[PDB]
Ligand binder design. Structure first.
Ligand SMILES: Nc1ncnc2c1ncn2[C@@H]1O[C@H](COP(=O)(O)OP(=O)(O)OC[C@H]2O[C@H](O)[C@H](O)[C@@H]2O)[C@@H](O)[C@H]1O
Ligand SMILES: Nc1ncnc2c1ncn2[C@@H]1O[C@H](COP(=O)(O)OP(=O)(O)OC[C@H]2O[C@H](O)[C@H](O)[C@@H]2O)[C@@H](O)[C@H]1O
Ligand SMILES: Nc1ncnc2c1ncn2[C@@H]1O[C@H](COP(=O)(O)OP(=O)(O)O)[C@@H](O)[C@H]1O
Ligand SMILES: Nc1ncnc2c1ncn2[C@@H]1O[C@H](COP(=O)(O)OP(=O)(O)O)[C@@H](O)[C@H]1O
Ligand SMILES: [Mg+2]
Ligand SMILES: [Mg+2]
Lengths: 398, 96, 185, 185, 400
């Protein structure tokens, strides 16, 4: 169930161990794609499954004619999707520059289908992606608790919490705008919004507990590059009216250096800059002394991130906490022989003789809605909500 | 060998207390019961006596020749314990 | 590729005024906790234990004061002995007439040294019974040699309703299961 | 429009010289009086109770000194216990070796936490008798358990004309009312 | 067999004494040709046997004509090898000056054999001398422990350890480049190394608030120092030296250049080469004239005159301490007591009988070897005695 250093722990010692880790100089969180399935998202297995069911003609070409994907993992549903999209984009650009007509129209169909499939599943509320006050709904109840508990546990004079993620949906922004918090994501301006890498060095001050940081490692639905060689950000309504509507209800793919998700168009030196900056900043954070990190919802299928995390244990003051539901299955599959790279990677660090590593397993005791409650509220935090009963009366005066 | 258990160290022979080798002390709230312990043992340590006046239930302060330095201890619970207690009034007055 | 110590520092000595010690903290420490290879330890509250590295021994001290002087912080401490290494393990000596040097680093005390401080001799372990745990941290277990207890006399003191009879029962029951050829009345 | 606390502070900690706590006060009426959702509170003279924010516990202390160092004002205080959460409410523990860290803010105690400090152990209520009201603020009722009170002997002392007979009559009558099968002489 | 002013003392007292001398202001170590015999080296009397077994024809002419060596010494294997090469170079130089063509070959042919013999014994790894990461092998396990123990027991505001040696091989450099330590030796540069004697007064510091460095004085030269056409002394790397001149010395049989090499104490008549030798001795004499010094000697045979003279004079200062290892007291005490032995034995036995507390001699065969020297030294309490980094490195390498 719960392992630290190779042996077992109980609920009370673990709950007391979590509390002391939140009072260190640096605190961070790393979230994956499984943290959004409780509010309308999907896992990569489901995306591949639905694509494989919907488009059975294009699947033969990718396997036979161009060798972009293998058979065994296609059957098992273990393909990396953003790597496939990046490779397809490279193929299309090469075909375009050397003037081959047969392949240029062949790859447009594949790319448009892949974008349709991955865009449809990231709109967490369907047609109501346009309207305002989306964070007021009950699906976003636990993101607010996460942010509140993570801010209110800092003593004055300590740094603000930092958040990393591999998603490209808008759950955290909608949740944070409803509390009254301001997040720094690297952009500034309203009528023309641009990316400045030095916005991560600023903080507010009162001249008479406001802010946090957000790092998006795979892009976002509202980032695009125009005819000018700069990257812009717009709001959800404007993006929906501009290009998101046509992706879903039409056969539209005519700009190839436009969208900045998921990890696509890395061969352009204007677009690769953003990804490089995000990853460098992530690598610098876990190299500081007196640091703690929590990981939840992330399946250890990335070689670069695994390489970074392991090399940081060489410092005596770095601690990490990991959540992995399907743990027994991995243990049996690797003791008997076999398993993929994720299973070997997680099992090899579960068995170390380190007091800096903690692994939590279970069925639904390692889910996102179980991670939030292990984190405590302070004794003087106000919890009784009595301003809404006043707002309803104010509106009832009419 | 002798083992003595009293709640009034002040009502004891000054020679009997002064000729022990190990002392255990639970909460002791009276200014004349602390003087007996003070004069029974040596000087050279006063920061340790101020604790005894505010120990909780079940803690002790041990010092002697079986201990390299004085310790504050949280004692385990015996199983099975001694006889529970004397009679209780509420049960008998409600046995209609 | 060289590591002199696998533990971080807390502050450095800035003055000596006889037998009292004065320490200045660094800039980052605000949350009263410091971490290492084994876990997290508290360092700033009065009554705690810390240590200074002096050559090839470790000097052990106890905290008394803590105040202001972003402003700086300060600490006062007193020494109560030192820890030494002889063959393959460690021993604790209770002589406290040695002081560190100006600039000496101050370190937290991990849980491995804490076991050494509250320990009995290795050859006497078969002659020991268990009483309880450390009260401030509740990690270390306390043992005592029966030979050194029941050689001279022993005293048990306390008020009413605080646990004298519990200790008497716990102590007397164990001795019967270790030295069955013993007289107790 | 995000809030960390709905009751405003009075000062902050600037020292810990052993068992004492030293407090510096904010300027103006900000350092004497506070207004909140349930009324108004104040700390004004030696004998009052004050509280310190320490994360997941609340430390309880009593005032002893006040003096001029607009001039600056200071306070000394001593600790009693602390408060924490159990299931959906709170409980009071009575150990007095824990202290707050430097820079912590000090707040006055509302009547809601006073109702928790002076309560009984949540199960003797079916056998509890009401005696009066606390003297200083007169907003908390005092209860006592019959089995614990009338187990060993009891002593009532005082001069003449001050109220011994009132107390005897009150106690005996409302013990007779609760248990009609009682024997009293 | 441990003595202190003539009185035998047990082991524990000796250990408590060594523990107390390691925490003084100044600490030093002197090492000889016996300290590298556990790595693949040879002593001085193992070189003479090889020479006189391999070249029996020059031995007659080198005794019966030029009077450069005695019969008693060459029969008893008591030849000073590096004191003969200097005299040979002098002879060859004078013959070249006065233009005696017949006498040049007879010396160019024997100087080509003396180098061919002494050079081969100092490689320590044979053909692996030009490879990288030689400090990861098991032969250098105790040099690392010595260097690590010396640095770890200094307190802030104290000097750095100093190490002197008469070996001219590369053992200590290989050992120190594996721990990550930096050793100062008087040279600076990369594309041209040059000798700067004034940088023995330099030290490091940290700009944020590190103290990981030491000094190394090589008394008889090195294999990697040489003098090019210009009158400046250069240093190269082991691979480069091997590809430049060492290969031909070991293989080719008629290879002699001239006043080129700077080992072992050979071309002293030149006035730009003796400058390098003089500085090491001046600084050695300067080091041991300080108030709170302690010096350990191991591997040295006491067959030198100038070093003995310097050591004797430094003892008339009441706060200088010496510890000496010599695995042959028993075979020398009797030979001195009966009739008198050699100069080395006479020196060591005159030193043993002194009625001071400032001298300590250790004997007993294998009990006074280099390996036994290391474990008599202390070990810090907070020094990490475990293995955690290597497991993580193995896991990292295994990845992908
Ligand atoms: N409700 C839940 N709560 C928590 N975890 C859950 C839940 N449901 C499933 N899981 C677990 O959540 C995990 C879902 O793993 P996947 O979504 O494939 O992994 P990723 O988000 O890293 O994929 C993106 C990466 O792809 C590239 O490799 C790059 O690294 C990208 O970052 C499984 O363990 C589920 O059991
Ligand atoms: N394993 C060992 N460990 C320690 N000592 C050893 C060991 N094996 C042998 N010995 C001893 O190591 C010693 C070897 O002594 P030598 O090599 O002849 O003397 P040097 O190194 O001073 O020769 C160079 C000097 O010659 C001129 O005098 C210049 O001054 C030079 O400095 C013997 O005592 C062995 O018993
Ligand atoms: N260390 C302890 N841990 C748990 N319970 C304790 C401890 N010490 C005393 N008690 C409880 O207190 C109760 C009465 O204690 P007791 O030993 O009778 O006090 P005394 O005899 O000193 O009046 C017992 O029922 C016991 O369960
Ligand atoms: N709690 C009380 N509230 C109001 N009056 C009181 C109280 N206790 C005592 N008194 C007053 O004290 C007077 C006499 O007190 P009494 O009960 O005779 O005390 P005692 O017996 O000690 O002289 C009574 O007239 C009563 O009014
Ligand atoms: Mg009793
Ligand atoms: Mg009356």
């Amino acid at each position: 169930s719960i392992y630290q250093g190779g042996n077992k722990l109980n609920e009370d010692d673990f709950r007391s161990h979590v509390y002391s880790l939140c009072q260190l100089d640096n605190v961070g969180v790393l979230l994956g794609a499984g943290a959004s399935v409780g509010c309308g998202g999907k896992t990569m297995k489901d995306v591949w499954k639905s694509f494989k069911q919907n488009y059975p003609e294009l699947l033969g070409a990718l396997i036979d004619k161009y060798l972009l994907v293998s058979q065994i993992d296609s059957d098992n549903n273990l393909v990396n999707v953003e790597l496939l999209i990046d490779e397809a984009t490279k193929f299309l650009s090469v075909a375009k520059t050397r003037r081959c007509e047969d392949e240029e129209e062949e790859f447009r169909k594949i790319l448009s289908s892949l974008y349709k499939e991955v865009t449809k599943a990231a709109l967490l509320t369907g047609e109501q992606f346009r309207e305002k006050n989306q964070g007021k709904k009950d699906a976003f109840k636990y993101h607010k608790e996460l942010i509140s508990k993570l801010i209110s546990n800092r003593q004055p004079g300590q740094s603000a919490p930092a958040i990393f993620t591999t998603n490209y949906d808008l759950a955290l922004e909608w949740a944070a705008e409803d509390l009254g918090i301001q997040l720094f994501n690297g952009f500034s301006g309203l009528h023309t919004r641009q990316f400045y890498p030095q916005n991560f060095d600023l903080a507010f001050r009162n001249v008479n507990h406001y802010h946090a940081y957000l790092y998006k490692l795979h892009g976002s639905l509202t980032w695009y590059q125009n005819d000018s060689l700069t990257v812009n950000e717009v709001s959800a309504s404007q993006a929906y009216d501009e290009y998101i509507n046509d992706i879903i209800n039409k056969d539209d793919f005519y700009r190839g250096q436009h969208l900045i998700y998921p990890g696509a168009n890395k061969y352009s030196h204007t677009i690769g800059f953003v990804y490089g900056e995000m990853f460098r900043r992530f690598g610098e954070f876990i190299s500081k002394p007196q640091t703690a990190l929590f990981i939840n919802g992330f399946g250890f299928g990335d070689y670069h991130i695994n390489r970074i995390i392991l090399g940081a244990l060489l410092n005596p003051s770095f601690h990490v906490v990991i959540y992995y539901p399907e743990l027994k299955e991995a243990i049996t599959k690797v003791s008997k022989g076999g398993g993929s790279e994720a299973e070997k990677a997680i099992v090899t660090l579960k068995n170390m003789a380190f007091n800096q590593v903690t692994v939590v397993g279970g069925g639904s005791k390692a889910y996102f809605n179980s991670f939030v409650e292990h984190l405590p509220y302070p004794v003087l935090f106000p919890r009784d909500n009595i301003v809404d009963e006043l707002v309803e009366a104010i509106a009832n005066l009419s | 060998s002798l083992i003595v258990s009293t709640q009034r160290p002040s009502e004891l022979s000054p020679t009997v207390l002064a000729m022990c080798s190990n002392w255990f002390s639970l909460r002791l709230t009276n200014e004349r019961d602390l003087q007996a312990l003070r004069y029974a043992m040596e000087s050279g340590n006063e920061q340790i006596l101020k604790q005894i006046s505010g120990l909780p239930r079940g803690d002790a302060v041990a010092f002697g020749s079986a201990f390299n330095l004085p310790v504050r201890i949280s004692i385990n619970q015996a199983r099975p314990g001694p006889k529970s207690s004397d009679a209780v009034f509420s049960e008998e007055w409600a046995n209609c | 590729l060289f590591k002199l110590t696998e533990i971080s520092a807390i502050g450095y000595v800035v003055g000596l005024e006889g037998e009292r010690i004065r320490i200045n903290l660094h800039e980052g420490l605000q949350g009263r906790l410091a971490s290492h290879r084994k876990g997290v330890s508290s360092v700033t509250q009065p009554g705690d234990l810390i240590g200074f590295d002096a050559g090839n021994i470790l000097v052990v001290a106890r905290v008394t004061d803590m105040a202001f002087v972003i402003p700086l912080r300060q600490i006062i401490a007193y020494a109560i002995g030192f820890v030494k290494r002889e063959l393959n393990g460690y021993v604790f000596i209770s002589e406290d007439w040695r002081l560190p040097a100006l600039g000496s680093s101050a370190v937290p005390l991990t849980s491995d040294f804490l076991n050494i401080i509250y320990s009995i001799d290795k050859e006497e372990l078969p002659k020991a019974v268990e009483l309880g745990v450390d009260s401030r941290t509740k990690t270390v277990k306390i043992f005592a040699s029966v030979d050194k207890l029941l050689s001279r006399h022993l005293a048990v003191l306390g008020s009413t309703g605080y646990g004298k009879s519990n200790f008497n029962a716990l102590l007397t029951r164990k001795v019967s299961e270790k030295y069955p050829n013993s007289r107790i009345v």
